[model samples]
Target: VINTFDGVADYAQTYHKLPDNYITKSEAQALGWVASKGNLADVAPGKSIGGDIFSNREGKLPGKSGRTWREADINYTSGFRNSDRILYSSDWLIYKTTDHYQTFTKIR
Candidate 1:
């Protein structure tokens, strides 16, 4: 439930921030989340990796000065990482890239 599109996105929209379950990539890493191993559950039990500064280097999403973008895993509840990801911005913009970042569709 924590990794769904509406679940996470709507929570941010309503609360004006990511849920407490979301932690930055660096924090997750320090907790032993190497990503390739998908060991977040084991290392940081009950914690999910999120809120990391997302660089729009691909220009796939809209951008502007002082705007910040972040990414979170969706449909992620198991062994390895998936192609599904949710991109969100400081301005309340939300998007989904189900094709492993190849394409994105606005969710809000």
Candidate 2:
């Protein structure tokens, strides 16, 4: 089982599988998530925000037919969450960013 953000990212790129750490944004919301606070552990421990549709409305990333994008917040060790994230898609495309969506580097 993948345990770290980088491990999950590499695994996704290699095997096209999402690790156990990822939870849907809606699921996080249900767990009492308030983005402004980034305090998911208050209700659910050892979980990170993930597995939500990324519309790609801005068309910044490469596009292809039948591509479905998903996003995950990264490095949630404690306190406020960082801006880093790992965005991936159904077609095995993964990207990482430390500055939110302002930039991305493809992982697969």
Candidate 3:
């Protein structure tokens, strides 16, 4: 899950370094690989598996991972041309209000 939001605060005064645990946990959850059995946070979640690229012009394919990629391409272009190489992206929280995301920890 690649969030389009800031991983940290954008202002001054209250600005501080985010914790390591916060980042690691948030990243894992984003990928739907959460360790615990509780819902820490829930957002738009999806699972995709692919190996090769597929052109959306041609509809469904009988391949394996390649088939998934084709579906994604069609979805992205709305069956039109979306000539853009989407590089890797991911999301993680600056995490707050959780045991891992707390205040008063020694900063040294």
Model 1, global lDDT? 0.83
Off by over 4 Å in 2: 1-5
Residue 50 local lDDT, model 1:
78
**Candidate 1, 55-90: lDDT as tens digits:** 889898999998999898787765666798899899
lDDT of each: 0.83, 0.77, 0.24
After superposition, candidate 1 runs with Cα above 4 Å error: none
Q: Estimate each model's TM-score.
A: 0.89, 0.84, 0.16
Highest lDDT model number: 1
- Rank ordering of all candidates by lDDT, starting from the highest: 1, 2, 3
Q: Which tens-of-lDDT digit does each residue in 1-108 have in candidate 2?
A: 344557778877786766776788788787787878868777667777777888889997888999988887777765566788888888877888789788889866
Segments in model 3 whose C-alpha atoms lie over 4 Å from true places:
1-15, 24-26, 30-36, 39-108
lDDT of 2: 0.77
